[PDB]
Structure formats: structure tokens, C-alpha cells
Design a protein around this ligand. Structure first.
Ligand SMILES: *[C@@H]1O[C@H](CO)[C@@H](O[C@@H]2O[C@H](CO)[C@@H](O[C@H]3O[C@H](CO)[C@@H](O)[C@H](O[C@H]4O[C@H](CO)[C@@H](O)[C@H](O)[C@@H]4O)[C@@H]3O)[C@H](O)[C@H]2NC(C)=O)[C@H](O)[C@H]1NC(C)=O
Ligand SMILES: *[C@@H]1O[C@H](CO)[C@@H](O[C@@H]2O[C@H](CO)[C@@H](O[C@H]3O[C@H](CO)[C@@H](O)[C@H](O[C@H]4O[C@H](CO)[C@@H](O)[C@H](O)[C@@H]4O)[C@@H]3O)[C@H](O)[C@H]2NC(C)=O)[C@H](O)[C@H]1NC(C)=O
Ligand SMILES: *[C@@H]1O[C@H](CO)[C@@H](O[C@@H]2O[C@H](CO)[C@@H](O[C@H]3O[C@H](CO)[C@@H](O)[C@H](O)[C@@H]3O)[C@H](O)[C@H]2NC(C)=O)[C@H](O)[C@H]1NC(C)=O
Ligand SMILES: *[C@@H]1O[C@H](CO)[C@@H](O[C@@H]2O[C@H](CO)[C@@H](O[C@H]3O[C@H](CO)[C@@H](O)[C@H](O)[C@@H]3O)[C@H](O)[C@H]2NC(C)=O)[C@H](O)[C@H]1NC(C)=O
Ligand SMILES: [Cl-]
Ligand SMILES: [Cl-]
Lengths: 15, 426, 426
């Protein structure tokens, strides 16, 4: 898909 | 003898659709109707205790909101929570209420992850969900011959609730779940000119069916550059994912509807550019109970909240808080009526789930998951006048695209262009 | 007259390097040394109140841990927090302590985001940080001629703390921050055979310098498939990012060190495959104070905690909880000595930050950010015997790669292969 790096630490706003 | 209801919402900031200055009155209205219904919680005096989801700077916080939620639990032991609407606020509080076995009601929290009720148990979403946007895009592709490749562009202001992300997350995940077609995505930043070359490059390489989640100004500027680069409705179609109709005025007055007009002399080129563009918004409720609600809502908000509620799509959020709160009192009355208590969250919630209901927003269906079905509207330019108007309507419970006022979806080619070009994208 | 110290750690689950059954005794030891030091908090009786970071199922929870952190705050008003070690546990508790103006100490929480002390203020990391792994990779590339392209593969079991992610997040972000070279990444799942065709395809197309964060068995299987596909140390190099040395035994006994040996008749081919492979781990402390600490730690854990502490790299986590707690008592004594109180978190923390310290782990340097510098070891196969041994060492404070026992990094070509092939990857 995408590699979300630095996008917060929560199993909601991450990929 | 009294039902304590804990609210975690922006109590001071009013910029949010679920701001308390807008949901507060909508809740006052619902509490007023319960007192006058003898069939709803007879003899009960439902109290309310409030909590600011917002931090110091006034924005809703992934910290202030859960901290607020705990202080309300240990001070009042409420039976139900209301809000938050912010995704990053709602997520932590939802895990707390799901642990506490306390129901959670919100019109906000539209993200894909909130859908996971194994984690967010007893969390009932009476507002729009973004997974529901996938449903409409699915119906729209099935009923328009696009079954290969589409392109998504989304921007976010850093440090916000990341709204365009979760909008595209809920659309990407549900459309590939149902069609397994190629869906390309690209994030950008509106204030950075460095990205616009990248975007126009990707527009003509990564698809012809193009969805954009951006501000109105960003989506306009993109259309101008698309027109400039010779991209027209013959080969392309641009869906502005503008759910709250920020690029449009209210459905009440301000006739007609022109998003391309900006008053900068570029409006002449903008109108022609928007011939390849369509806007996907939410569906303004048709029922005249909505219009009475708005009227009572505006009055009550000016009087008790010293706030002015302008007309617009945002108002289905307070409306759905109103209706969702009615949906709960129904179910609690139902739960009390068969020997249960107001704390039987599992019994209470399952009544609310898989259930149609008639509230100020008209027909609303809480699906098997606990998420209100979302109805969408599709806007298109009348090539004659240039104004936009609703030409399609998606009933979310039935997943049916119905034409609006016998209007035809304008296509420069007489029919939608194909999602893939002639001899490949090369 | 007494200093309350709140701990949020896995109190029952012992599988974690920061499990209480392992950190608890390491803390008992540090408290014991404080009572015997007349120069450390004279006359003070430091208390400790504990909290399980773990949920019902016993894993550390993004919900249990912050809920725990609140009961300790509103019941004891501690002066400092200890743990959590889990990233997804620490992040929420960190935002709570940063709001509460209370220092937080942990050897865990290695993720890139915890580095942002504008959000996680008063959060001092006395253990490894993954950004620090970027530093070692940077030094390793600068001192080996790779300044173009590298490839990363990482896998995670769903629902864990996602360890290989944050390891690759901290490595990707810090190496592109310092070199701006092409770093390709690919996630996979170990138990899914469908990915292994995808991985071997990407190996010979997306780079020659290849880093893998996986279990030992997964990294081995990949090496066998690499060998099978004709991929050797002449053109490739495979860095297992095995920070806690799971693919290796303890540095105390069990001589020699063979990770490719598995006892399945494939070991013969495995040795040859591992000729192109090197392992990046943490640095076992050389100082004999560590070895005494381990001895006191194992005894104290068997006696008071009914737990058996085996030897290995994991033990620097309790060791760093020990040292970090000494680092704080130092600074609090220092703060009391200049008229300040134990609640002057900002003064206390700034003493701890930018400061070298001598603890059971030897020399440790809290950088300007509040993160212990991390020392790494590089392991390589002695082509003679086939066993692995340390050939390089990275002082994290000095960022110097120093050879170990006059050993030479084995290369099949006499020198490292180039990060880019001949006439492109085609
Ligand atoms: C989007 O699609 C939804 C899916 O169908 C629509 O929901 C439907 O809503 C209609 C009414 O709005 C509802 O009809 C009947 O529902 C009752 C329960 O089954 C039934 O008892 C009703 O019947 C009674 O009332 C009529 C007069 O109204 C009498 O003539 C009858 O004799 C009887 O007394 C009523 O006919 C559907 O059941 C319901 N469908 C589902 C699947 O639940 C939404 O309305 C639609 N929205 C829009 C805006 O298009
Ligand atoms: C990794 O690199 C680090 C960065 O250099 C090393 O840290 C260095 O550690 C050494 C000692 O381990 C330290 O040396 C001096 O530090 C004191 C503060 O400046 C200084 O006062 C000391 O001097 C005294 O003691 C000596 C005997 O030890 C006497 O001869 C002197 O007269 C005096 O009384 C001491 O010399 C460095 O300052 C320190 N560097 C930095 C930048 O802080 C790590 O040790 C190194 N670790 C490994 C394993 O490689
Ligand atoms: C009410 O909520 C508004 C939206 O949630 C909020 O607007 C936004 O405010 C933030 C900061 O509060 C701005 O962001 C800035 O954030 C950091 C921290 O200061 C800066 O370093 C960044 O550079 C960035 O500029 C948003 O830009 C801003 N957005 C908009 C559209 O206004 C209001 O401030 C809130 N107001 C009150 C009174 O609570
Ligand atoms: C102590 O912590 C261990 C690691 O944090 C934990 O092991 C892991 O346990 C989880 C569930 O507890 C397993 O995950 C499973 O999770 C969901 C929920 O049941 C399942 O649907 C999945 O299919 C998945 O199998 C991990 O696989 C497991 N991993 C390992 C290496 O054991 C222990 O269970 C914890 N034990 C105690 C006593 O707390
Ligand atoms: Cl909110
Ligand atoms: Cl933890």
C-alpha cells in the first residue's frame, strides 16, 4: 500500500 | 431516577461540526423532547456532565479528551458518552469506554478504524462513516463502467485531525474490498508549490478517473492547471471529495451554486475547466422536520450559547447527535421495559444496532456494525448556465443511485470517458 | 521526606525485556544503592507504586497502561514515572506525563516519534532509540563506500508492539536525514509463503545492500532462498537487524556462535548462505560492573520475584532502568542541593539531559534530546570455522567504527560489493 513513517503512534492514524 | 450523560466535545472551539456551541443546543432540543414524551424514560431526569476534548491551544487533543473522559467517569459514573467527533480524540476515549462497558455515541469519528467494534465495543456511530463513502464510490463505478483504474489525491494541513486521509482511507479500503481494481493514491500539501508539478504529472499517468480531497481553492487551482495542460472531460473526470460542501453554499438560499467563480478574472477560464469536474457531498435531508430542527437549532444556539448557526451541510452532525441521542433513550426505555437497567450496555447497544429510526434527519439506518448508513449527493455543472446542481443521489441503506429532478450527468463525450486510455497510459 | 515513583510496566507478563520480573529486581538494586549512598537523597525514603501496562490478555495495552498511569497519579501524586517499555503503551502515558509536568524514565519506547520531546516533554530515554540505529547505519555506509541505494525488508506479527516497523522507521528516517540516498523498503509477513516470491524478486531488483528485520528463522530461510537463487556476497550483503541477538546465544558461555546451524540437514547449505550475511546487534557492556550487576540481578530475581533471568542482550534493558533511576536520584539530589524541589521536573530533567554518566552499563551519554546514545556491534562469519564473532564496534557518543580483536570483515570479493550493480539493475 503505503509506508507511513512518522505519522503518529496510534493504531488508528497509521498504516 | 436520573441518567447521567457524559459529553466529550470541543466546549470552547466552535470551528468543529461537533462543537458544543452547535451540538449543545441540538442536544438541548433532544432532552426537551424526551421530557415531553411520556413514552420515553418515564419520570427520569437525564442529567449531563461536560468535558472539553480540546487541549490548551483549543484544538481537540488525543490527550485532553481521554483525560477529560476519565475525570467524568470517576466523578459521575455516566451511563453513556457523547462525542468526541475528532478521530484522534475519539479513538483513545473509545478504547476507554469500550473497556468500561459504557456505550459511546457520536456523529463524528468517521475513520476506517472506528469501524472495528471488536476494539471499539459499544461505540455507535450515528453520523457519516468513511467506509460508507466507499459504498457510494463502488455504486458509482459499477453504474458508470469504470472497472480498472482510478486516481486519488489528498492533502492535509499538518497537525489537524487529518480529515482527507481518513476520507481516502475509508474510500480506498472499502472500494478495493469490493472491486479489487487498481486505486492509486498520492498525498500532497496545499501550501507547497513544489508538489503541483508532481500532481499534474501523476494526473496524466496514474488514471483518468480522478478523485481529489482538498480545500476548494486547491481543487480549483488543480482544475486550472489541468485545463492548462489540456486535460478535459473527454478523457478525464475530477471528483472533488468535498463531503461538507465547503466549495458550495447552503441549500437554503444563495441561488445559484458556482464554485469556480472566485472574482479574480480567472473565473472565465475556471468555468470551462470545471466542465470536467464533479463534486461528491453528503445529502441534505429532504424532510421538513430537518428544516424545523434547523430553525429551532439556530434560535436555541443564539439564545443559550451566544453562537450563530449558519446553514450548511455541517448541520447534519448536530442533527445526528440529536437523532442518535433519541435513538439511545428509545433503547434504554426499551431495555428498562423488559426488566433491564440503563447499564446493560450490551443489550442497549444491540437494540440500537441493526435498526431503522425516524429522526429529524428523516430515515436513518444503524447497520449491523453500529454505523449510520450515509447518503451522498453528486453535483454536476449544467453546461448551459455553468452552475452546479444535484444530478445523482445515493441511498446508503439501499445502495441505489437515483437521478435528481430528471437531470443528466453532463459528459463532454455524451458518455463517461474510460478509466483507461487508448493504447495504455503511455 | 519520601519520593513516590510510579511504574507502568508488564507486571505479570515476563516475556518483555522491560517486564517487571526483570526490571523489578534491577530497580530493587538501584534503590538499595541509593539508601547506602549518603550523598544520594540523604534521609529520603523513596517509595514505589506499581501499575500493569498490560490488559486482560496479558499483552501491554494502549489502554491498560494509560488507565494505570491515571490511578497512580490521582492516588499517590508520584514525582516520576518508570516505563512503559512498549511503544504503544508508552506513547499515551507519555502524553499524560508531559501534560502533568512529571518526568518519565524508560529504557524502552525506542520509536522515532518518542524522540519528539515537544510532545513527550520530560520523557528521558535511558535505553536504545531506533534513530540511533540510523546513526550506526550512517557510519557503516560512510566507512564502506555505499552512497546510493539500499534495501530494507521487515515483518511483524499482527497485534504486537510492531517492533520491526519502528526499527525500520528509526533507521529509514535517520539515514535519509543524513545521506539523502535511495532507501527502498518492503513489509512482509513471516507465516505467509505468498510473500517469499515477492521478497526474492525485490532482493535482486531494489538493491544490493540489504537490511532484514525478521525472526532468525525468517532471515535464515531468506538466506537459503537467496543462495538457491544464486545471490552471493560478491554482489550482495545481508544485514540482519537483530538488535537483541535473538539469532545468537549469550556472550557469557555457549562458545561458539552459529546462527545458521539448525539441525535439519539444511545446515550445510545454510553456512554457505550466511557467508553473504552479517548481523547488527547491540553492544554487550565490557565493564566488569555489568557482570556483577547481572549476578546480583539474577539472584535478586530468583529470590524475590520467583523468576530466572537468562543471559543475553535483553538484560541491558533492566540494566538501563537501573542506571536511569540512578541518573534521576543524582539530579534530584542536585536539584534539592540548589534550593529546588523534587517536582522541578524541568530543572531535574535538564540536569539529566546532555550529561555523561557512569552506571552498571559503563559509559552512557544522554544526548541533547534526552535519549541515551546507543552502541552497536557488527557480527560476521569467520570463513574458517563458520561461526560468527564481533568484527566492528560503534561508539554511539563518538560515532566511530572501531575494529574488534583485530578482526577483518569477511568479504568474498576482498572488499564490500557496490550498492549498485554494473549496467543498472536490469
Ligand atoms: C432509502 O432506502 C431505504 C431502504 O428501503 C428506505 O427505507 C424504507 O423506508 C420505508 C418508508 O420510508 C419503509 O416502508 C415501510 O416500513 C415499515 C416497516 O417495514 C412498514 O410497516 C410501513 O408500512 C406501513 O405504513 C404504510 C404507509 O406509510 C401503510 O400503507 C402500510 O399498510 C403500513 O401500515 C412502511 O410501508 C421500508 O420498510 C424501508 N426499507 C427497509 C429495508 O427498511 C428509505 O426510506 C430510503 N430513503 C430515501 C430517502 O429514499
Ligand atoms: C565512547 O566515546 C565517548 C566519547 O569520547 C567516551 O567518553 C569519554 O570517556 C572518557 C573516559 O571514559 C572521558 O575522559 C575524561 O572525562 C572526564 C571529564 O572530561 C575527565 O575529567 C577525566 O579525567 C580524569 O581522570 C583521568 C584518569 O581516568 C586522569 O588521568 C585525569 O588527570 C583526570 O583526573 C577523563 O580523562 C571523556 O571525557 C569522554 N568523552 C566525552 C566526549 O565525554 C567513551 O568512554 C567511549 N566508550 C567506549 C567504550 O569506547
Ligand atoms: C479552533 O480550532 C481550529 C482548527 O482545529 C484552530 O485552527 C488552527 O489552529 C492551529 C493551531 O491552534 C494552526 O496550526 C499551527 O499549529 C502549530 C502550533 O502552533 C504551528 O507550529 C503550525 O505552523 C500551524 O500554523 C492551524 O493552521 C489553524 N488552522 C485554521 C484553519 O485556522 C483554531 O486555532 C482553534 N481556535 C481556538 C480559539 O481554539
Ligand atoms: C505475554 O506476551 C506475549 C507477547 O506480547 C504474548 O504472546 C502473544 O500472545 C498474543 C495474544 O495474547 C498472540 O496473538 C494472537 O492475537 C490475537 C488475539 O488472540 C489472535 O487473534 C491472533 O491470531 C494471534 O495469534 C501472539 O501470537 C503471541 N505471540 C507469541 C510469540 O507468543 C503472551 O500470550 C503473553 N502471555 C501472558 C501470560 O500474558
Ligand atoms: Cl472532539
Ligand atoms: Cl509496557
Amino acid at each position: 500500500r503505503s509506508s507511513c513513517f512518522g505519522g503518529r503512534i496510534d493504531r488508528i492514524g497509521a498504516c | 431516577s436520573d441518567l447521567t450523560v457524559a459529553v466529550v466535545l470541543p466546549l470552547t472551539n466552535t470551528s468543529y461540526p461537533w462543537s458544543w456551541a452547535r451540538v449543545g443546543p441540538a442536544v438541548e432540543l433532544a432532552l426537551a423532547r424526551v421530557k415531553a414524551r411520556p413514552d420515553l424514560l418515564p419520570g427520569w431526569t437525564v442529567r449531563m456532565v461536560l468535558g472539553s476534548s480540546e487541549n490548551a491551544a483549543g484544538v481537540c487533543s488525543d490527550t485532553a479528551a481521554p483525560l477529560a473522559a476519565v475525570d467524568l467517569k470517576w466523578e459521575h459514573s455516566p451511563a453513556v458518552f457523547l462525542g468526541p467527533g475528532c478521530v484522534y480524540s475519539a479513538a483513545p476515549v473509545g478504547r476507554f469506554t469500550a473497556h468500561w462497558r459504557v456505550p459511546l455515541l457520536t456523529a463524528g469519528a468517521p475513520a476506517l478504524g472506528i469501524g472495528v467494534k471488536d476494539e471499539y465495543a459499544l461505540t455507535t456511530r450515528t453520523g457519516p462513516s468513511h467506509v460508507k463513502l466507499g459504498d457510494f464510490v463502488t455504486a458509482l463505478h459499477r453504474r458508470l463502467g469504470w472497472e480498472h483504474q482510478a486516481l486519488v489525491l489528498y492533502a492535509d494541513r499538518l497537525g489537524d485531525d487529518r480529515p482527507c486521509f481518513f476520507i481516502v482511507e475509508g474510500l480506498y479500503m472499502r472500494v478495493r474490498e469490493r472491486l479489487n481494481i487498481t486505486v492509486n493514491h498520492q498525498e500532497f500539501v496545499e501550501g507547497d508549490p513544489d508538489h503541483y508539478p508532481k500532481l499534474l504529472r501523476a494526473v496524466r499517468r496514474k488514471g483518468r478517473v480522478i478523485y481529489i480531497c482538498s480545500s476548494p481553492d486547491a481543487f480549483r487551482n488543480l482544475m486550472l492547471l489541468a485545463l492548462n495542460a489540456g486535460l478535459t472531460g473527454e478523457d478525464y473526470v475530477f471528483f472533488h471529495l468535498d463531503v461538507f460542501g465547503q466549495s458550495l453554499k447552503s441549500a437554503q438560499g444563495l441561488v445559484p451554486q458556482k464554485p469556480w467563480e472566485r472574482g479574480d478574472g480567472q473565473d472565465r477560464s475556471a468555468r470551462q475547466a470545471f466542465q470536467a469536474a464533479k463534486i461528491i457531498t453528503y445529502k441534505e435531508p429532504d424532510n421538513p422536520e430537518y428544516l424545523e430542527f434547523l430553525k429551532q437549532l439556530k434560535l436555541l444556539a443564539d439564545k443559550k450559547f451566544n453562537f450563530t448557526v449558519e446553514d450548511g451541510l455541517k448541520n447534519i452532525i448536530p442533527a445526528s447527535f440529536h437523532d442518535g441521542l433519541l435513538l439511545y433513550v428509545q433503547a434504554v426505555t426499551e431495555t428498562l421495559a423488559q426488566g433491564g437497567t440503563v447499564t446493560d450496555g450490551e443489550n442497549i447497544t444491540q437494540r440500537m444496532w441493526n435498526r431503522s429510526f425516524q429522526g429529524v434527519t428523516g430515515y436513518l439506518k444503524i447497520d449491523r456494525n453500529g454505523d449510520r448508513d450515509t447518503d451522498f449527493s453528486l453535483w454536476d455543472m449544467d453546461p448551459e448556465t455553468g452552475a452546479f446542481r444535484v444530478v445523482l443521489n445515493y441511498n446508503g441503506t439501499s445502495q441505489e443511485l437515483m437521478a435528481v429532478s430528471e437531470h443528466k450527468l453532463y459528459w463532454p463525450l455524451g458518455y463517461p470517458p474510460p478509466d483507461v486510455p487508448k493504447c495504455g497510459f503511455d
